[PDB]
Write a protein that binds this ligand. Structure first.
Ligand SMILES: *[C@@H]1O[C@H](CO)[C@@H](O[C@@H]2O[C@H](CO)[C@@H](O)[C@H](O)[C@H]2NC(C)=O)[C@H](O)[C@H]1NC(C)=O
Ligand SMILES: *[C@@H]1O[C@H](CO)[C@@H](O[C@@H]2O[C@H](CO)[C@@H](O)[C@H](O)[C@H]2NC(C)=O)[C@H](O)[C@H]1NC(C)=O
Ligand SMILES: *[C@@H]1O[C@H](CO)[C@@H](O[C@@H]2O[C@H](CO)[C@@H](O)[C@H](O)[C@H]2NC(C)=O)[C@H](O)[C@H]1NC(C)=O
Ligand SMILES: *[C@@H]1O[C@H](CO)[C@@H](O[C@@H]2O[C@H](CO)[C@@H](O)[C@H](O)[C@H]2NC(C)=O)[C@H](O)[C@H]1NC(C)=O
Ligand SMILES: *[C@@H]1O[C@H](CO)[C@@H](O[C@@H]2O[C@H](CO)[C@@H](O)[C@H](O)[C@H]2NC(C)=O)[C@H](O)[C@H]1NC(C)=O
Ligand SMILES: *[C@@H]1O[C@H](CO)[C@@H](O[C@@H]2O[C@H](CO)[C@@H](O)[C@H](O)[C@H]2NC(C)=O)[C@H](O)[C@H]1NC(C)=O
Ligand SMILES: *[C@@H]1O[C@H](CO)[C@@H](O[C@@H]2O[C@H](CO)[C@@H](O)[C@H](O)[C@H]2NC(C)=O)[C@H](O)[C@H]1NC(C)=O
Ligand SMILES: *[C@@H]1O[C@H](CO)[C@@H](O[C@@H]2O[C@H](CO)[C@@H](O)[C@H](O)[C@H]2NC(C)=O)[C@H](O)[C@H]1NC(C)=O
Ligand SMILES: *[C@@H]1O[C@H](CO)[C@@H](O[C@@H]2O[C@H](CO)[C@@H](O)[C@H](O)[C@H]2NC(C)=O)[C@H](O)[C@H]1NC(C)=O
Ligand SMILES: *[C@@H]1O[C@H](CO)[C@@H](O[C@@H]2O[C@H](CO)[C@@H](O)[C@H](O)[C@H]2NC(C)=O)[C@H](O)[C@H]1NC(C)=O
Ligand SMILES: *[C@@H]1O[C@H](CO)[C@@H](O)[C@H](O)[C@H]1NC(C)=O
Ligand SMILES: *[C@@H]1O[C@H](CO)[C@@H](O)[C@H](O)[C@H]1NC(C)=O
Ligand SMILES: *[C@@H]1O[C@H](CO)[C@@H](O)[C@H](O)[C@H]1NC(C)=O
Ligand SMILES: *[C@@H]1O[C@H](CO)[C@@H](O)[C@H](O)[C@H]1NC(C)=O
Ligand SMILES: *[C@@H]1O[C@H](CO)[C@@H](O)[C@H](O)[C@H]1NC(C)=O
Ligand SMILES: *[C@@H]1O[C@H](CO)[C@@H](O)[C@H](O)[C@H]1NC(C)=O
Lengths: 435, 124, 124, 435, 124, 435
């Protein structure tokens, strides 16, 4: 009666894991390695297609992680190795024009370094932050001396994130979820197909996500398992919170030759007096932001459940403070002033003190270290807080604390709406057609 | 006129009228390697589909009819249900357990068919 | 005789006598990447042309006569004026502006032909 | 009433840029890296084909340049680094058997060098040619110490150019221009198709091109724009001019161990009188050669003018002076003896004095250096001048001076007959056939 | 069963019944450049053989008979011997000296055929 | 009458050389980087097919050799370099608590090492085997100081061989010889087709082959040309000879940081009575084995010929003694006790007086040295002798000796059964079909 008819070019796909490539259009991410982005990328709406998405089981996130690590490391390959710098260092306190809150923050240190000629030595001095030196038992050493060689970042290279568009290879496609309020794990009733994702900026931070996407209408709370205290909660925002960060000191940068073709950069001195690095947010905006967060948490934890916010504690600065790169400098800000409230049913700012660190161990690895050269002058940046990383502790009161660690979650947030599938164009169906 | 996978969700008999729109998109420092491997892989998948159509005697056709009868054990629906209500994604899931059987039958059918033609051209 | 492109420059009529001469020459440390990147291109270009011929209903006959009529708006030269008095390079320069139109028409007529064959064979 | 007919295998092409690979036919060009050349490449003459060539837009030159830099750097990758050599040197002049040609051009230096055991030192005596040594305030350093490290070239690897054939990948072809007296930018009425170029020796020199191809009948003068005073003029020759170069000194080579598995080579002494390196050309041959150049220049500038040849403008030795690699030695020769003549509408030689330099900074890059090991014995080579690089200074006597230093001008002097085109085998035409 | 080369050693007459099984078996740090090269080569060999089948007018079929007559100078043996007493390995040793000749003839024959088809269609 | 018919998918092949890949199944062989194997899905017996095999002309053997070396080098790429150890060592004898079998075997050395800070030095003591320390004129240096750089093997990467399966690239197939009593060069009446070889353990040894396959019916003698005394003879055994090898001493391992992020491992002390490393072979089985070997040699040399086994000639330890990696340490053993008899027409065991070396220069490459970290504890290995490598002495008595050292032969021992052929799917034949 019926025969097997073969069709090719059939709109069928299966979930798949493949390799994606970057298309983007003096840079940490070596963007010249990517193809350029097509000025007229396409997107198509797929009416009546409902697909299951799972942001917590997504290999796009893992590839983004891998690419960022590799690109970051590759940019340090041609840079100076400051092995001549790991010497007994002789240090005293900077006590000249010190704000009370920086008493013994900054230190003055003396070295016997190598020079252009191997038979000579050059006596130099520089200023260091306390966070990067450890006492010898006036004798100090750099903190990386007992774990790794440190590479100086090349000064011409910018650390400012540039949006990277991820594109599927031929035969594959990326599905995108357009469903408002999608939490990342259920069926998505409204999808579209794209070849490339939007450009995603590889912004690196802890606790407070910066310069990401906003929700259209309401705060969306996403988690792998909300009742599991071992999982993080990613909260997006439907409004930005403006944050103004500064390093309010006019630093004068000096450099020396340490060997043929190699030079070391350091802070020589500071012009004028000093002030503690800090970040400002508006108190009122922050209070509205939390009010929205609390309402959504109550939907999940109970209408009459008390929601409390608290500072996090335990671990290194990367998981207790808000770290970020501002002006190319590395900041560690105390967010306790933001997360200190209990909720039952005009230029007033919140000021968060911050510290500055130059020896940076990224991606929670050991054995690698980078020396961040100082930046001349005074640093300011303004950024938008577009989501929070919270963890729940553990009756009556639920306590949430800022979370952090595992960079996969920052990327997971931007990629929550994308899925990779493979096209299977060949298939069969019964018809009345024979031979 | 939609484009690429935009026909998904339409009925099977509607989607089947636009096959070329997707056929055209097939084939269209390890950052060098990732890009190169992707190109090779795209070719390999393309060629496996084409080889398979070749074995079955469907090379170059898009829509190809055969001599293998449809089994009610693979699926049993009215043709109007299959072509007017169901879409291709649903269908692929429904008969995903019979594709190996069907492909084996198509390959056997074409091999016998070729032998019969060779004999006829020799005048039996 | 006149291997590879040796017939280039001859008129279109004469040049068409040697199509297989050029067709058969198609496809045919850090450094080792320049060969892999070259080989993959030779293959992708080969396959994209073959795919296009397949979509158009030309499984690969070298010369495929289609059912799409020629428009005087593309070219109004008579046939001798094309085949006896021009070479292929000259011809391509003149027709280039319309080749996307022509290619679209060829894919469209083939889809209509495929549907018609399938329906006749349901009646057969 | 005609129909579209599709033809595949149509003999047409388009200008295109693709990747070319090398095919060859103990050497710095690593010809073992290339695919060996078939002993019988074919050349197919194309009757009735006129194509436009433009040597100044020919990207084959850019690829050859990149391959040359790449091969050069790869050949030094496994060689001994001489960082331990950048030490203060104690130097006096070598005046012991001077003919006054070399007075002041050779110094006797001593220094404290490392040994296999890192806790031991050795005192080393070696000779330097002055151009490589600069004063610190008898205290000297090598010139590269404040730019970069220097790598010793491996003594077993020859620098002699080996013709390298370039080959197009399938789908591409190289069209060659057969017309005589072709200036590189107009239409070429007689062409042929090849898959591979002839082998081109990557001879590296400044001002006077060595061991290239000759013009078929007459001197051909080629330039990007003959009236642009910022452009170089490439003058080919229809006859070679023989040049005999030498370093007429018997050098005794010594070596020391500098570390585990590593050794340094240097000139130990010189046996016999110390004399200046030099190159000879025939005065008569050279004067005939210029007369031919002058006639062709008059065709471009008027036949009622004066052509005057003059000295290079000054600046860096690598640009102002003629240079070449002879025996593996690096020579810098003064050409003022060749370009000193005003042209108005028996065994008499010209001797050009030369200098020897062992620290080489190639390809006009900054941050890399190579040390050229000394060569045992006496060096002599004979080569052909096959073209000149001239510049013209902006009813007046025109002034021509030696130019060059931009290596693309040397390659472009061989790769002027070739262009790469993509084969486009698929196309359509009308006919009476329909189906 | 007899997968891959299992039919080898049987006579040519028997071996021809297993062509399909060997058709589907074709086309499947610094270490990766070895795997990637292997993948590329498999594709290149596959495509070169398909290219010849296309040129000769066989294309997607496993068995094609053509219009080129058999010459006794290539081999003068009774069909009852070649197809029942020699194996495809033995035959290759015997016919190898003439396969370039045969391939050239197959190409020319198809070109003549294509010209004839184009002309017949033009004549309607 | 007859026409040409083209058949595609024809069961034929040709001898060919292609690239094979690793399918494998903390290792120096990067076993995680290979596509994994399937559960030996099949081999196809080929009825009525006789192929010619030649184990002496086999590219599988050459590729395995090259891949093993490349993997070896890669495993050291990220490991600590030990350059700072090449200093004058101050050494005295270890004759404390010895048995006098070891008198002169161990020395107690002291030296000044670099440390985490480059301006500090730390005097250490360690024990060395005499084989790795060479007298300078009490003052010693490591043996590799004047020839090579030395890299410490990573303490977490094992030298335990893991079977590696080699698989054909698509379009190729591996034919295997199934016949018994196949001597490696003649026709093999019974063969089968496989896609992957069995896994081969890349065991490194000389004189005797360890952990290979056994012959099932008789001892088999294989050589390229047995009448040529310049060739080695490979002998495959029917029964394993079990050999026990130990290092009776209990070593204490210490670790010193020698620079940021790096440490050196060295024998600190030995707990107890110092004794000679040694290895046991039971006489009953060894004497039976030699008799079986002799019988087969008699088939080739005559019944009336006397066969003598003799020890090795002088030369480098690597080729005069048996060598293996046991527990991570490299042993050298005198096999003379196994080859001292003349053959003419109880648990009593043979003890081999073994010695240990830590500085390794494998694959006979000069300039590449490895340091084998010491192993904590006592070492015991049990392995099977599955074959021999013998050389022939150049009238009435023939003499054979335990020669060897060329690693290619160890691989020939297992790869002799395999051949790689290219599949050639097209062919033509005459028939009665026309069109
Ligand atoms: C730099 O200032 C710090 C204070 O910020 C001094 O450290 C304190 O020393 C007293 C003993 O005299 C201890 O009891 C405190 O606990 C220390 N405080 C901290 C934060 O370490 C330090 O001695 C000063 N150094 C110099 C060179 O003046
Ligand atoms: C996101 O929304 C989905 C609904 O689309 C929620 O999924 C349900 O979760 C419960 C509890 O595990 C299951 O019993 C249901 O079967 C799930 N429904 C579906 C359609 O999958 C999910 O829990 C929500 N997650 C968050 C963080 O809000
Ligand atoms: C999504 O499904 C709706 C049906 O629920 C499709 O709309 C129908 O299309 C047919 C054919 O044109 C019409 O005869 C019906 O009257 C339409 N029904 C309704 C309710 O509008 C719609 O086309 C589907 N979407 C896609 C992309 O195929
Ligand atoms: C190049 O052009 C010439 C004409 O200028 C071609 O020669 C003609 O060929 C036709 C066809 O065989 C003859 O009828 C004419 O009499 C020939 N003319 C002359 C002057 O000889 C020549 O064949 C063309 N070259 C190529 C490769 O096609
Ligand atoms: C090495 O030779 C140089 C010249 O090549 C000497 O310097 C010159 O000395 C004369 C006087 O005899 C001056 O007129 C020149 O102006 C000097 N030239 C330069 C560049 O300074 C130099 O003194 C000699 N050094 C030694 C150690 O003999
Ligand atoms: C090289 O030769 C070509 C001719 O083959 C010269 O091209 C002419 O240049 C003038 C001035 O720009 C134009 O007006 C003509 O139309 C060009 N003729 C053609 C056929 O293109 C070119 O100028 C010469 N180059 C040099 C440096 O003299
Ligand atoms: C190997 O050769 C033997 C003959 O010695 C083949 O055996 C015959 O096979 C046919 C089937 O094709 C049977 O009808 C005959 O009765 C068999 N002969 C005997 C004596 O039993 C065998 O098939 C050949 N192997 C292969 C793979 O073709
Ligand atoms: C250290 O051991 C060496 C042996 O390795 C001792 O030297 C030997 O001394 C005997 C005399 O008792 C000589 O006959 C040997 O020829 C010597 N051999 C070598 C290699 O020198 C040495 O005396 C011992 N030293 C100490 C301090 O115990
Ligand atoms: C392994 O067996 C083969 C036989 O298959 C022996 O090869 C023959 O040796 C004789 C010696 O004169 C040659 O004349 C023949 O041409 C060889 N080939 C064959 C197929 O017989 C080979 O010598 C044996 N190997 C050893 C080590 O004895
Ligand atoms: C090597 O060691 C093994 C044991 O590790 C010895 O084999 C054992 O011998 C004892 C008697 O001494 C038996 O009781 C065991 O049963 C044997 N092995 C087993 C467990 O089967 C072997 O003899 C030693 N080889 C030599 C020659 O020393
Ligand atoms: C530099 O070296 C001198 C000895 O020459 C020593 O006294 C001084 O403390 C050293 N200074 C530093 C900063 O290491
Ligand atoms: C910084 O300290 C100096 C004294 O060392 C004082 O003269 C100067 O005014 C101070 N600067 C500021 C901005 O307080
Ligand atoms: C419970 O939650 C709803 C919102 O879902 C809110 O409108 C209502 O007032 C709440 N009731 C209380 C206060 O428990
Ligand atoms: C070598 O070092 C010593 C000091 O240890 C110094 O006196 C001597 O001048 C140095 N030699 C040279 C050539 O600089
Ligand atoms: C057969 O082959 C011979 C050469 O071996 C050739 O001379 C003859 O013309 C050919 N005949 C046919 C009909 O092809
Ligand atoms: C260590 O350095 C000191 C420096 O005073 C020297 O006397 C001693 O001999 C050195 N010891 C060794 C074992 O190298």
């Amino acid at each position: 009666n019926l025969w097997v008819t073969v069709y090719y070019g059939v709109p069928v796909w299966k979930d798949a894991e493949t390799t994606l490539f970057c298309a983007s259009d003096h840079n940490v991410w070596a963007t010249h390695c990517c193809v350029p982005t097509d000025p007229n990328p396409q997107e198509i709406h797929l009416e009546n297609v409902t697909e299951e998405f799972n942001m917590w089981k997504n290999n796009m996130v893992e590839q983004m992680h891998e690419d960022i690590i590799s690109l970051w490391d590759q940019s340090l390959k041609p840079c100076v190795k400051l092995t001549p710098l790991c010497v007994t260092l002789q240090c005293t306190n900077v006590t000249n024009n010190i704000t009370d809150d920086m008493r013994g923050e900054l230190k003055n240190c003396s070295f016997n370094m190598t020079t252009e000629l191997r038979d000579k030595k050059q006596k130099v001095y520089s200023l260091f932050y306390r966070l990067d030196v450890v006492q010898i038992n006036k004798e100090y050493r750099l903190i990386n001396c007992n774990t790794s060689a440190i590479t100086q970042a090349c000064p011409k290279v910018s650390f400012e994130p540039i949006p990277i568009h991820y594109c599927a290879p031929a035969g594959f496609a990326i599905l995108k979820c357009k469903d408002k309020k999608f939490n990342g794990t259920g069926p998505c009733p409204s999808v579209s197909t794209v070849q490339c994702t939007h450009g995603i900026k590889p912004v690196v931070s802890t606790q407070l996500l910066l310069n990401g996407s906003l929700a259209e209408e309401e705060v969306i709370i996403r988690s792998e398992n909300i009742t599991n205290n071992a999982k993080n909660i990613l909260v997006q925002l439907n409004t930005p919170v403006q944050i103004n960060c500064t390093r309010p000191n006019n630093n004068t940068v000096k450099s020396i030759r340490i060997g043929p073709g190699q030079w070391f950069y350091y802070t020589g001195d500071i012009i004028g007096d000093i002030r503690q690095a800090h970040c400002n947010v508006s108190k009122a905006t922050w209070n509205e932001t939390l009010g929205k967060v609390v309402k959504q948490l109550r939907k999940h934890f109970g209408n009459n459940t008390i929601i409390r916010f608290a500072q996090s504690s335990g671990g290194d600065l990367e998981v207790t403070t808000h770290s970020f790169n501002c002006g190319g400098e590395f900041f560690y800000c105390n967010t306790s002033g933001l997360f200190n409230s209990t909720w039952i049913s005009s230029n007033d700012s919140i000021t968060l003190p911050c510290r500055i660190k130059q020896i940076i161990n990224m991606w929670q690895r050991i054995g690698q270290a980078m020396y961040a050269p100082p930046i001349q002058g005074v640093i300011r940046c303004v950024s938008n807080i577009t989501g929070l990383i919270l963890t729940r502790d553990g009756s009556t009161t639920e306590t949430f604390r800022p979370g952090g660690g595992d960079m996969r979650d920052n990327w997971r947030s931007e990629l929550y709406k994308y899925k990779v599938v493979k096209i299977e164009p060949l298939g069969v169906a019964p018809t009345r057609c024979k031979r | 006129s939609l484009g690429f996978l935009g026909a998904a969700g339409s009925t099977m008999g509607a989607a089947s009228m636009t096959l070329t729109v997707q056929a055209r998109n097939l084939l269209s420092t390890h950052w060098g390697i990732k890009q190169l491997q992707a190109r090779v892989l795209a070719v390999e998948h393309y060629l496996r589909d084409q080889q398979l159509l070749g074995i079955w005697g469907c090379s170059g056709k898009l829509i190809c009819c055969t001599n293998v009868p449809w089994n009610s054990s693979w699926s049993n629906r009215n043709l109007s249900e299959i072509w007017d209500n169901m879409t291709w994604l649903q269908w692929d899931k429904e008969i995903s357990n019979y594709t190996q059987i069907i492909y084996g039958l198509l390959e056997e059918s074409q091999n016998q068919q070729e032998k019969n033609e060779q004999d006829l051209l020799a005048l039996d």
